[PDB]
């Protein structure tokens, strides 16, 4: 790989520079290089990996949705035929998005998850696994679509089981996992009631534990609680 000659510490330093520069494709390539050094990632390094790839794939998903909407409009009655270009370009963006998701999943499988023994690392990576399978599910249509959805569900579920056993109900990773798994239920699995139930129970159980927290911890936990409440407001 093209980052094989660069020191691990240099790749991390450059990832932080790339973030400041809003160069997220570079950031992701630096963090991929850092993972490929073979060592486990620290808390801060896990967050850099996640920020890099969520920014890259987020841009691709936004583009895909714009193109898919145009393509949908084209297939309505009354619409003039404009040739294969919209489908072709949606397909190009889709293939690139799938490639990035496969790359992230490949890093998780080789070998981040298997070496992650502490709850904060393992839950973090399984949450990532669920998210990137969820992004693959958003664009899936073929024979493996149910399997893609089930792979996201399985990852999220394992993360949930560990987080419930090993983390307090206010832990930000636990909260963000619950937020994203609730979105999976609502947007991917056609299970809005499960989505609502999970968001409500997560919010309530976090509320009850806020008393144990420092001011700083409270800020982080309450921020994600408000995001859960925002979705509950949207869904009800």
């Amino acid at each position: 790989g093209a980052m094989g000659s660069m020191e691990r510490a240099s790749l991390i330093q450059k990832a932080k520079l790339a973030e400041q520069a809003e160069r997220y494709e570079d950031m992701a390539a630096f963090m991929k290089g850092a993972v490929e050094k073979g060592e486990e990632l620290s808390n801060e390094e896990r967050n850099l990996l996640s920020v890099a790839y969520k920014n890259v794939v987020g841009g691709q998903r936004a583009a895909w949705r714009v193109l898919s909407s145009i393509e949908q409009k084209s297939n309505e009655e009354g619409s003039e035929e404009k040739g294969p270009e919209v489908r072709e370009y949606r397909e190009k963006v889709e293939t690139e998005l799938q490639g990035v998701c496969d790359t992230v999943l490949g890093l998780l499988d080789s070998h981040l998850i298997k070496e992650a023994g502490d709850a904060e690392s393992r839950v973090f990576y399984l949450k990532m696994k669920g998210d990137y399978y969820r992004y693959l599910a958003e664009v899936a249509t073929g024979d493996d679509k149910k399997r893609i959805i089930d792979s996201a569900r399985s990852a999220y579920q394992e993360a949930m089981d560990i987080s419930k056993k090993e983390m307090p109900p206010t832990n930000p990773i636990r909260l963000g996992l619950a937020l994203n798994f609730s979105v999976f239920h609502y947007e991917i699995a056609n299970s809005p009631e499960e989505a609502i139930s999970l968001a409500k129970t997560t919010f309530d159980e976090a509320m009850a534990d806020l008393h144990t927290l420092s001011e700083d911890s409270y800020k982080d936990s309450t921020l994600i609680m408000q995001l859960l409440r925002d979705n509950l407001t949207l869904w009800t």
Binding site: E19, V51, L179, V183, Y186, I224, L227, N231, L234
Partner: peptide, 9 residues
Amino acid sequence: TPSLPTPPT
């Protein structure tokens, strides 16, 4: 629906 945002590190 919004999922978890990605603030700067």
